[PDB]
Design a binder for these strands. Structure first.
Ligand SMILES: [Mg+2]
Lengths: 552, 1335
DNA sequence: CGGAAGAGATTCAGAG
RNA sequence: UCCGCGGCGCG
DNA sequence: CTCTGAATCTCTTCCGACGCGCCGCG
């Protein structure tokens, strides 16, 4: 390597070869002199050790170091090891025609297409630009095309648009884990500096928008283009190879919007009329003369495939709310109307997708998914499901429940100070009574929160489901579970010592109120334990995957 | 009462606990360590003199020549700090030492020396530490963190489990010296004492027992007691006390005084033992069979011939008894032979002895330490004495022996560093005690075994290594010393120690580079504790016990702030009130508590001792008279916490603040949020970047002032006084009469720091925040640095934020952003790059820096000087010419350059702008070698540098000379006062007032010299400075002149940036949205930032909710102030309004009023409230729900904080009220322009024909292995062939494909991967034959 | 350095 | 002037 | 007595995710 001045930090192999050739030169010179046996065997010994170190270093004591302080590299080092030749230059090698950027959402694309920033688009397809420019003949040599593309004249963006129209590309996620980590998309030119993704793919990628970065690749030949559009495509991969359940299940916002969409308070303005179709219901909602959701009889027409290959129409006067009908307005023909009369949970929508695929082929399922995502964002923006500090209603009986709890802990202590019980027995049963208190407070707060809403109901009174934001986010299945609300509003359970032993004093506070230092310290114990667990587990997981993919 | 400087703006505060202790100096560790490392302390006491007196004196071995130490001195640094950083040299200082050399008479060793020599000798230089606690090595800043390692002492570990899993625990004893070989004691399942030295082979303890000059009888008497038997006629009567009968079955009929107490077989409980104790006689009678397995203690020998009847550690047999009774030695001393109280491990331990002799033991350890060597008696003795008797190669610090004596339950405090024999004997005794079961092992995570180091002691250690090396060299030279033939420095060399310290500061796992972006990183990157580096474990030697936090960490090590990922808990941070003990342990304060009253005075407590006492929880309801309103309170004991009585505790914690780190203490409402979320929030906050103009966060914690002041990134008044002149460059302050020194004090000058490159390419800047002619108070801020304003810390800004899902643009966490922020340029940031051009002197033509370049247009020279360097202030873009550097490519053969040629082609090597970046020239730096031509542009740059370098001195002298002229005026009051010429004759020219008095001229003439001396120092300061600018610069050989240029880029917000708050909320900006579509209220104002409410359920961080309501309250006062101040109302209206504003608290210690204030003071305070109300909040004693609720009542906002909102696009009501408010947004330095990158066809590598890597080179991405197997998982085949053969490796394939693609016939060719051909070569290069085969 | 593994020296170990 | 080590950070 | 042998303890070796960015020193 030519380095500064006459200095060249060359490879260790040069030094090893120089050493051994000097050794051989001295030895072959000295055998001419009929030297005594002692010195000649000393030279043969040191030559033997030198060539042994040349072939492999480290197998002998006091391995010869390199420049300053580290053992020099060898041919054995060049062949084996993570830094060896295989796993850095044969199994995986750097490739041209690629690029890297950061992801955004841009939730207005179609599932079969993705965006791509303009400067990246110009950079990637320069040979295609040269070829098409030669095809139209507006340039003569490579230099003319090069200067024209460097000037970024407006006369080339139309060629650039033309060469995209169905020329696909590839995406990559750096910690590629399973087969869905690589997909293909039909690119569309977009302004900006970041990659745009359809939202339903990030769940398969398990790629949050925290700042993950993608790689791109470009198929070149006709074989490559057909190969990409055949199997690389996002459309024809809708079942996981691990289990038949789909992989385009919605995650966070459309599920919230539809869940809020299909709930009915018993009394609301616009209650108690009849309509002949979803279209006029949509019109009435846009008029604002009726609530988003109220019990309304409607005339619904539905199709079904009793005939072997043909659809049959039938009509009725179903009883439902307006939101169910307006959602029915976009549903494809095959599915029966009974498929939407429930509350449309996470499991419900997954079953929706699975049944739609199993009965109505492939394409209508895809367009149904895209359109339901559109409507989910639309009505989730329309809803306005904000959060508020006043939402988290704390149960009141829990305070005297706690008071009782320290009453029995004082009682058991004062038996224990009379020799009645031992430390282990009292330990177990204070754990038991504390757990029972946790059960009671958790159940109490759940029943207080679950149906707090009450209404006069066109008359005296009635009790119905709740409309708290926290509850509707919870039972939707979007984010969190019951335990999260248990931790937040109610008592935060009880934590254990780092070894695994349980602390006798439970966490008698909650996040809505203040927290004293010691319980926060124990929470720190738990959180640090979990973070260390995952951080150490990642490497073993990856290594196990490597061995298993090698063995079979 | 408050200073006028605090009266710029007062911060609303909450909290009920009255603080008593002040936050200490936040840089005490580094400052104390470095100050202790260099200072003239007698007797050393962990100082440089200690290392000197350790290494000194030096004596020639039997040569009667002595070198003895005298003293050392340090001179001033030859350079400054700032221009030293600019140039590139370190900020070191010379080391001047005086050495005394004497040579004894060869006829008398104790006789007087013939001569004495003494001289000052210079050797090396050592780096210096600036007030901010920094270091300079090569024109940069580097900082050394503090190391954390196990203290030298003894440990006892269980190691239960892995070995022989279906078996009980083992035990092991470890001794680690401060400097020396390790030594390990451990057990084995067969239960033998084994010793291992320096992780070598396993050896029995008996070898070192005998090598310590001990006979077998001595050893057994040491480890065991006596059981005596007598040769007696009646069944050999014998003596027993019931102490050894504690818990045994009766193998005999228990009889005494001819009366059997209990028969054989009955277990002897305590009752039988006491029955024996009544009239307890010892001599009893037993049968003979019991001694069958019992072992003799002494060595009885025959008397007929002296043959050994029985040796130690062998049992007895009836024949042995008979033929020892034939000799008549009645006393039979035997072994105790216990089972559950004294395990007889020593017996078989000595039984499996390989040898039996001291010399044999020495030979064995000789061959154990060095394999394959001839055994020598003296060599074995020499190595044995050179392991634990040699004070040179083995030693312990005083702390080592301290913990050694503490662990062994000893009482001695001070001994010797080297070990002894009885100490390791005691280690034997305690280890066998532990194996018996009694006693207790010690853990590792307990901080009473954890030791902290700092810069001073490791610097001393490296320096001591250098001195022992050079001492070896000096003694080697002195072995041939002569009779006074030289001056005592020719034998010393400054090269070794200087090289050693320079390598230590330069290359070390403890001297990390410092991340210079914001003052928070500055203060948190210094108080950092690491467990890596030499002497400690590495990144993957970590189990789980080191990872998790320990209860002793409370109040001493922050549990919540640590980096996550590859290393967790290894880079833990130190607490806020913690400090370093004298020995090297940690300490935390406590409040002394009497019987029922807590005193104000405090104590510092170590880690080991705190278990002896009990401490109460900090936020206990202390009464007004220092009592507890309850009769019971929870208190943390040595093990855990428990509710204790009124009179059980003796110490009180100082405050709630002492639990977390500095970075953690800045998060408001921390107590309402989860641990991991707070951790990631702190990890982001350490990485912020200052914006164009700062502004105080509306929700603070009160710690901003302390961190802002203590971190020296701002101008602090060394003395209080009166502003005289202010400017954007310098500040002039008048000194008060009381503060000025009696001898010609004068005034002070503060030089600001302008736009300059930082270590992280950020713009360090200083803006004054003081008006003209203002009384300034001692120890207060004058100029604001980056991300600081008016003396408070302000990283990000405050946004109007709402929580609502909108059109999927906030899908997972993506941050939607309004156009108004970039409209105001309120997140605009600045980066400063650095481009370097070298001018080497190489063959084939020395490099030229001319402006003449072939094969280029005139566009370059349109923006270039004739020197070739760009003019200052050029709007250059990517790929533009910056510096013009070009390198060229008898009587009959040299003239052919004109005959058959035209001219020599000089090759361009111009440093261009890296592609993709714009910029503007702000500074050009040029350095020149000693004796090289200086081109035109370099000449004026030093000329502009020259004239400013003399104006500031002239400006300084002009003010400096003013003070001496007042001495003329004070003395010469009466006389001829000139009407008009009072100023034409300046304040100096008064000795020429026409005539002069015979005595007045004397003082005038006398002081005339001292002005000349002030001129003289002006001359020398001018003359010294003009040399520094004129002199060249030693560099690497070959290079001739450096060309440093600087760029400034104005970074704007664009979709893809990384936004974050102060409660862990991540995010990237998805879409920029024009103003018209943003949601807006009934009043008319829009909203700026819209988030996703779904973050709260999943990741439980409710704290970000509570701050948002406060933001409305903070603005809710401010806009009401803004509403009233727009119309000129009388001052008392706001005066009562602000009075109630700073009123209206539950129970606070603030207790401020407004009556004492002047009207103009209140008016100038009002205008600083145009933006709102800064509200303080302690970490744990913060505001609760109720007082937040009633605070909004003072505003004009709904009680719930819940507001209905209007749509921007469709414009209607929302049938759910939405939550809005304020929130503190900062910016991360992870942009998009520095990450997005691609290539089509660039360079290739040499060893393999593969594309390059990294973004700096025009390289691409790496096709990782993992996506390989992913690809054949789909039925795809051709791409796998196509990607890694024709696009990466094949050379003929790509060029054909490159030629084929430009014609549209997309076709692939197989080729052959040349990397595989590379593979076959070296595997061929050995004895292996391998190649291809038939086609 | 934890763990696995595997080869190798050792060391009883009943059959003699 | 583009090879190698160490350290920090990000996912 | 001498095995053969069947464990048994000793000693050595091989290994421990991926990808990128930044900075420093030979
Ligand atoms: Mg991520």
């Amino acid at each position: 390597v030519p380095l500064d001045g006459g200095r060249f930090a060359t490879s260790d192999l040069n030094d090893l070869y120089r050493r051994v050739i000097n050794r051989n030169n001295r030895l072959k010179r000295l055998l001419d002199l009929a030297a005594p046996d002692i010195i000649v065997r000393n030279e043969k010994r040191m030559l033997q050790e030198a060539v042994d170190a040349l072939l492999d270093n480290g197998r002998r004591g006091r391995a010869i170091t390199g420049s300053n302080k580290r053992p020099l590299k060898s041919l054995a080092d060049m062949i084996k090891g993570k830094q060896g030749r295989f796993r850095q230059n044969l199994l995986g090698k750097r490739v041209d025609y690629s690029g890297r950027s950061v992801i955004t959402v841009g939730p207005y694309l179609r599932l079969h297409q993705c965006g791509l920033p303009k400067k990246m688009a110009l950079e990637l397809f320069k040979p295609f630009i040269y070829g098409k420019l030669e095809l139209r003949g507006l340039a003569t040599t490579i230099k003319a095309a090069k200067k024209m593309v460097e000037r970024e004249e407006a006369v080339v963006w139309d060629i650039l648009d033309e060469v995209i129209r169905e020329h696909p590309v590839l995406l990559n996620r750096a910690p590629t884990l399973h087969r869905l980590g690589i997909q293909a998309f039909e690119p569309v030119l977009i302004e900006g500096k970041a990659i745009q993704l359809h939202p339903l793919v990030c769940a398969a990628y398990n790629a949050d928008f925290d700042g993950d970065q993608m790689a791109v690749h470009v198929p070149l030949t006709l074989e490559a283009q057909l190969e990409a559009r055949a199997l690389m495509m996002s459309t024809n991969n809708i079942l996981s190879p691990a289990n038949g359940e789909p992989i385009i299940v919605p995650s966070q916002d459309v599920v919230l919007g539809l869940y809020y969409m299909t709930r009915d308070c018993v009394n609301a303005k616009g209650e108690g009329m009849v309509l002949t179709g979803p279209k006029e219901a949509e019109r009435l909602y846009r008029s604002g003369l009726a609530s988003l959701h109220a019990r309304v009889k409607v005339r619904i027409t539905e199709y079904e495939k009793d005939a072997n290959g043909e659809l049959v129409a039938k009509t009725s006067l179903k009883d439902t709310t307006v939101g169910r009908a307006i959602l029915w307005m976009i549903v494809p023909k095959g599915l029966p109307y009974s498929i939407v009369n429930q509350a449309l949970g996470k499991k419900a929508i997954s079953k929706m997708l699975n049944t739609c695929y199993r009965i109505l082929g492939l394409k209508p399922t895809v367009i149904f998914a895209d359109q339901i995502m559109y409507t989910g964002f639309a009505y989730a923006a329309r809803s306005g499901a904000s959060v508020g500090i006043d939402d988290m209603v704390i149960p009141e009986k829990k305070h005297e429940i706690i008071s009782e709890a320290e009453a029995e802990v004082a009682e058991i202590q004062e038996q224990f100070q009379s020799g009645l019980v031992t430390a282990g027995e009292r330990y177990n049963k204070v754990i038991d009574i504390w757990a029972a208190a946790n059960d009671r407070v958790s159940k109490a707060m759940m029943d207080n929160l679950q149906t707090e809403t009450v209404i006069n109901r066109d008359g005296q009174e009635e009790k119905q489901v709740s409309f708290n934001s926290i509850y509707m986010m919870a039972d939707s299945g979007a984010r969190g579970s019951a335990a999260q609300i248990r931790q937040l509003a109610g008592m935060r359970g009880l934590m254990a010592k780092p070894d695994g032993s349980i602390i006798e004093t439970p966490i008698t506070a909650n996040f809505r109120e203040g927290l004293n230092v010691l319980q926060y310290f124990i929470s720190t114990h738990g959180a640090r334990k979990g973070l260390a667990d995952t951080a150490l587990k990642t490497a073993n997981s990856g290594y196990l995957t490597r061995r298993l993919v090698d063995v079979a | 009462v408050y200073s006028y400087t605090e009266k710029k703006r007062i911060r609303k505060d909450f909290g009920k606990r009255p603080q008593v202790l002040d936050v200490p100096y936040l840089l005490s560790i580094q400052l104390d360590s470095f100050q202790k490392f260099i200072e003239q302390d007698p007797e050393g006491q962990y100082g440089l003199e200690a290392a000197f007196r350790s290494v000194f004196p030096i004596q020639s071995y039997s040569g009667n020549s002595e070198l003895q130490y005298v003293s050392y001195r340090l001179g001033e640094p030859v350079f400054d700090v700032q221009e030293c950083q600019i140039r590139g040299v370190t900020y070191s200082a010379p080391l001047r030492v005086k050495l005394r050399l004497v040579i004894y008479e060869r006829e008398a060793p104790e006789g007087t020396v013939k001569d004495i020599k003494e001289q000052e000798v210079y050797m090396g230089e050592i780096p210096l530490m600036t007030d901010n606690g920094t270091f300079v090595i090569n024109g940069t800043e580097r900082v050394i963190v503090s190391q954390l390692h196990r203290s030298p002492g003894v440990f006892f570990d269980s190691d239960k489990g892995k070995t022989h899993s279906s078996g009980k625990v083992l035990y092991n004893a470890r001794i680690i010296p401060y400097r020396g070989s390790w030594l390990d004691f451990e057990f084995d399942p067969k239960d033998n004492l084994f010793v291992r030295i320096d992780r070598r082979r396993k050896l029995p303890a008996t070898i070192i027992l005998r090598a310590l000059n001990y006979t077998t009888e001595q050893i057994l008497d040491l480890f065991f007691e006596k059981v005596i038997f007598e040769i007696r006629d009646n069944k050999l009567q014998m003596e027993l006390v019931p102490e050894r009968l504690r818990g045994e079955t009766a193998s005999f009929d228990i009889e005494a005084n001819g009366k059997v107490y209990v028969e054989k077989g009955r277990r002897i409980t305590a009752r039988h033992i006491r029955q024996l104790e009544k009239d307890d006689v010892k001599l009893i009678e037993v049968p003979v069979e019991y001694i069958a397995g019992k072992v003799v203690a002494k060595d009885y020998i025959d008397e007929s011939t002296g043959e050994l009847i029985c040796a130690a550690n062998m049992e007895l047999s009836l024949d042995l008894l008979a033929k020892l009774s034939q000799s008549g030695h009645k006393r039979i001393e035997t072994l105790f032979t216990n089972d559950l109280d004294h395990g007889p491990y020593i017996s078989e331990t000595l039984r499996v002895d390989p040898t039996n002799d001291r010399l044999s033991a020495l030979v064995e350890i000789y061959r154990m330490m060095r394999p394959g060597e001839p055994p020598t008696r003296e060599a074995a003795e020499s190595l044995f004495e050179n392991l634990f008797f040699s004070e040179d190669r083995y030693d312990l610090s005083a702390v080592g022996r301290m913990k050694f004596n503490r662990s062994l339950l000893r009482e001695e405090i001070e001994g010797s560093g080297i070990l002894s024999k009885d100490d390791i004997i005691d280690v034997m005794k305690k280890l066998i005690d532990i194996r018996n079961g009694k006693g207790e092992v010690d853990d590792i995570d307990h901080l009473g075994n954890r030791r902290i180091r700092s810069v001073g002691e490791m610097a001393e250690n490296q320096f001591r290594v250098g001195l022992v090396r050079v001492e070896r060299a000096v003694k080697e030279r002195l072995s041939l010393g002569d009779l006074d033939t030289l001056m005592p420095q020719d034998m010393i060399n400054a090269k070794p120690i200087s090289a050693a310290v320079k390598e230590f500061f330069g290359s070390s796992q403890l001297s990390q580079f410092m991340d210079q972006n914001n003052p928070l990183s500055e203060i948190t990157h210094k108080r950092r504790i690491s467990a890596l580096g030499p002497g400690g474990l590495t990144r993957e030697r970590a189990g789980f016990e080191v990872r998790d936090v320990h209860p002793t960490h409370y109040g001493r090590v922050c549990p919540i702030e640590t980096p996550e990922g590859p290393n967790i808990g290894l880079i833990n941070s130190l607490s806020v009130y913690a400090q370093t003990n004298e020995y090297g342990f940690l300490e935390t304060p406590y409040r002394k508590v009497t019987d029922g009253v807590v005193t104000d005075e405090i104590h510092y407590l170590s880690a080991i001792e705190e278990g002896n006492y009990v401490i109460a929880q900090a936020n206990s309801n202390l009464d007004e008279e220092g009592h507890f309103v309850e009769d019971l309170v929870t208190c943390r004991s040595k093990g855990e916490s428990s509710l204790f009585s009124r009179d059980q505790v003796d110490y009180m914690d100082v405050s709630t603040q002492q639990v977390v780190s500095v970075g953690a203490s800045l998060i408001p409402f921390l107590e309402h949020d989860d641990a991991n979320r707070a951790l990631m929030g702190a990890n982001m906050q350490r990485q912020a970047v200052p914006t164009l103009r700062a502004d105080k966060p509306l929700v603070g914690t009160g710690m901003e002032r302390a961190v802002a002041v203590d971190s020296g990134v701002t101008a602090v008044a060394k003395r209080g006084g009166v502003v005289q002149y202010v400017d954007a460059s310098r500040i002039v302050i008048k000194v008060n009469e009381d503060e000025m020194y009696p001898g010609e004090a004068g005034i002070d000058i503060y030089n600001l720091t302008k736009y300059t490159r930082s270590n992280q390419n950020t713009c360090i800047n200083q803006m004054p925040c003081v008006s003209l002619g203002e009384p300034v108070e001692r120890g207060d801020v004058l100029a604001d640095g980056p991300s600081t304003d008016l003396g408070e810390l302000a990283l990000g800004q405050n946004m109007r934020v709402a929580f609502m899902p909108w059109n999927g643009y906030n899908f997972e966490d993506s941050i939607l952003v309004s156009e108004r922020v970039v409209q105001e340029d309120r997140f605009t940031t600045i980066h400063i790059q650095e481009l370097a051009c070298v001018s080497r002197d190489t063959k084939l033509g020395p490099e030229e820096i001319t402006a003449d370049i072939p094969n280029v247009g005139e566009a370059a020279l349109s923006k270039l000087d004739e020197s070739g360097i760009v003019y200052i202030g050029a709007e250059v873009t990517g790929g533009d010419i910056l510096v013009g550097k070009v390198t060229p490519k008898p009587e009959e053969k040299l003239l052919r350059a004109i005959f058959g040629e035209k001219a020599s082609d000089v090759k361009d090597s111009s440093l261009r702008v890296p592609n993709g970046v714009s910029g503007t020239v702000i500074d050009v730096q040029v350095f020149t070698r000693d004796g090289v031509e200086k081109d035109k542009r370099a000449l004026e740059i030093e000329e502009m540098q020259l004239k400013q370098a003399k104006k500031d001195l002239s400006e300084e002298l002009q003010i400096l000379e003013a003070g001496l002229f007042s001495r003329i005026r004070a003395v010469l009051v009466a006389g001829g006062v000139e009407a008009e010429k009072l100023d034409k004759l300046p304040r100096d020219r008064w000795l020429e007032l026409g005539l002069t008095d015979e005595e007045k001229q004397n003082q005038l003439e006398q002081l005339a010299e001292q002005y000349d001396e002030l001129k003289h120092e002006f001359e020398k300061k001018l003359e010294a400075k003009r040399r520094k600018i004129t002199q060249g610069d030693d560099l690497a050989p070959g290079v001739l002149k450096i060309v440093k240029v600087y760029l400034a880029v104005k970074r704007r917000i664009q979709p893809g940036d990384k936004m974050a708050g102060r409660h862990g909320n991540k995010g990237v900006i998805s879409k920029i949205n024009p103003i018209e579509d943003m949601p807006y209220d009934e009043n008319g104002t829009p909203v700026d930032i819209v988030l996703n409410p779904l973050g709260v359920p999943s990741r439980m961080n409710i704290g970000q909710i509570l701050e948002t309501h406060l933001g409305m309250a903070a603005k809710g006062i401010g806009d009401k102030i803004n509403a009233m101040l727009k119309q000129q109302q009388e001052v008392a209206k706001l005066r009562e309004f602000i009075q109630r504003a700073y009123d209206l608290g539950a129970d606070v210690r603030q207790k401020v009023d407004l009556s004492t204030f002047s009207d103009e003071e209140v008016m100038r305070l009002a205008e600083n409230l145009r933006k709102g109300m800064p509200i303080a909040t302690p970490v744990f004693d913060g505001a609760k729900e109720a007082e937040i609720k009633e605070l909004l009542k003072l505003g004009d906002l709904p009680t719930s904080g819940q507001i209905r909102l209007y749509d921007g696009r469709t414009g209607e009501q929302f049938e759910r009220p939405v939550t809005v408010g304020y929130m503190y947004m900062l910016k991360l330095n992870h942009l998009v322009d520095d990450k997005m990158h691609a290539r089509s066809t660039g360079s290739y590598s040499l060893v393999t024909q593969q594309p390059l890597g990294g973004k700096a080179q025009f390289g691409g991405q790496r096709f990782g292995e993992m996506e390989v197997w992913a690809l054949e998982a789909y039925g795809a085949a051709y791409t796998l062939q196509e990607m890694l053969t024709v696009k990466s490796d094949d050379v003929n394939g790509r060029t054909k494909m490159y030629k084929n693609i430009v014609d549209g016939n997309h076709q692939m060719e197989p080729g052959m991967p040349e990397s595989f051909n590379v593979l076959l070569k070296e595997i061929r290069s050995l004895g292996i034959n391998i190649e291809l085969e038939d086609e």
